[model samples]
Target: KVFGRCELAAAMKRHGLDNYRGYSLGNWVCAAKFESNFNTQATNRNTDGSTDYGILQINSRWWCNDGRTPGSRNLCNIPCSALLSSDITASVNCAKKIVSDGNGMNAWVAWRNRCKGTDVQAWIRGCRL
Candidate 1:
């Protein structure tokens, strides 16, 4: 499912994105905007043969087990397919693990390039959080 920006923000907030691990809710929303354009079923193949899955584009290499990514740590301990669901719990949870693993939002190149060092409040300003 593709989401409106505010809808996505609201959903993420419900799942604890708001100030989770010191990152603002808008930080997560902004990263999702550039990562997958708010599409839940989005997938991107990396040059190394791993895939990024879901709205947040959690990578298969270290986060989820895709059964095809060589040497996967599967730190999230779930199938990568879980990230494709519009329900988003698995995707959001995996993202939390990524940050909790000490990567912060910088784990996503899209965040580093687009959201980091910027005023991301605009991403959720009118969402009525």
Candidate 2:
């Protein structure tokens, strides 16, 4: 089945992100817009200061920096498409947690508000969860 906004929203809820629905949605959109322009299967070199990877732009090597396992470092070496497939929402949620335990959405919200347009970041920042 094709995953649209609602589908993606539901997926986010399933990952214990029900509280930040508005922020999550906004952050997701912002991340996509800034990182990959909404491309689920996007990958590229680190030119924007942060060496993040995947749809949510996870810095596998930095965040998941446990080089003990065989494929531990592989997370950073590979691109989003190579690590994840059609499960973009889940991957994004996972990456979000890996970075800031879901607080990364705050940064994304801030990016949209302080840098993009409306000040939705304040609303998201004050959200309970």
Candidate 3:
């Protein structure tokens, strides 16, 4: 599912993403935009040959087990397919774990390159928190 900017922000907030790990909701929303354009089914292949899944692009090498990544950690202990659902529940939970376990939202390079130090708050403007 493709979500509008504010809609995605609202949904992330609903899933306990707001201020998670000391990052604002907009930070998470901004990362989602560059990571997957807010599309639930988005996936990308990495140089390591692992896949990134869902809106936040949780990676198979560390976060999930696709049964394809040779030595997946599956730290989130979820099927990579779970991240593809439109509901985004698994994705949100996994993302929170990523930030908590890794280097915050910077676990997503998209967030580091595109969202870090930017006016991310604008991404969720007009959305009721």
Candidate 4:
């Protein structure tokens, strides 16, 4: 099961996600919200027969080894099941690798469909931390 938000941004920052990979923190929060609602184990089947896993909803096509998907890039070098764990140590590491790659948040469809062109400032509006 997923836990509460628990100062997510702070944790992201601790994992070095404070606006350094390419997109901003607001975009991160927006993507996280739309992707998995912060559900660590949130998994969805994509129309392409691929899958989205975890809080970032990382796809099986590129980031992790989802044995079902042959030729998966596994850029994060992690098993797809690993992403579903509540322990996000592997998830955070994989997320960092994902954001560092090109296309940035565009890698996440949720960003374009939901967070793009919006005043995402509200993502961190009162969480001044």
In model 4, the Cα lDDT at residue 118 comes to: 97
lDDT of each: 0.93, 0.47, 0.91, 0.78
Better of 2 and 3 by lDDT: 3
lDDT, candidate 2, 1-129, per-residue tens: 234444445554566554443454445544545555445555555443334444555544444342332333443333434434566554655555544654445444435454355542332343333
> Whose lDDT is greatest here?
1
Tell me the number of clashing residue pairs for each predicted model. Answer: 0, 1, 0, 0
Ranked by lDDT, top first: 1, 3, 4, 2
Which ranges of candidate 1 are over 4 A from the true structure?
none
Q: Taking the tens digit of each residue's C-alpha lDDT, what string does model 1 give over 29-70?
A: 999999999999999999999999999999998999988988
lDDT (Cα, tens digit) per residue for candidate 3, span 34-128: 99989999999999989999999999999898989897799998999999998999999888888997588778888999999999899988987
- Candidate 3 minimal-lDDT segment of 10 residues: 101-110
lDDT of 3: 0.91
Off by over 4 Å in 4: 1-6
- For residue 123, model 1's alpha carbon misses the true position, in angstroms, by 0.3
Q: What is the lDDT of residue 78 in candidate 3?
A: 94
Deviation of model 2 at 2, angstroms: 9.1
Single out the weakest 10-residue window by summed lDDT for candidate 4.
1-10
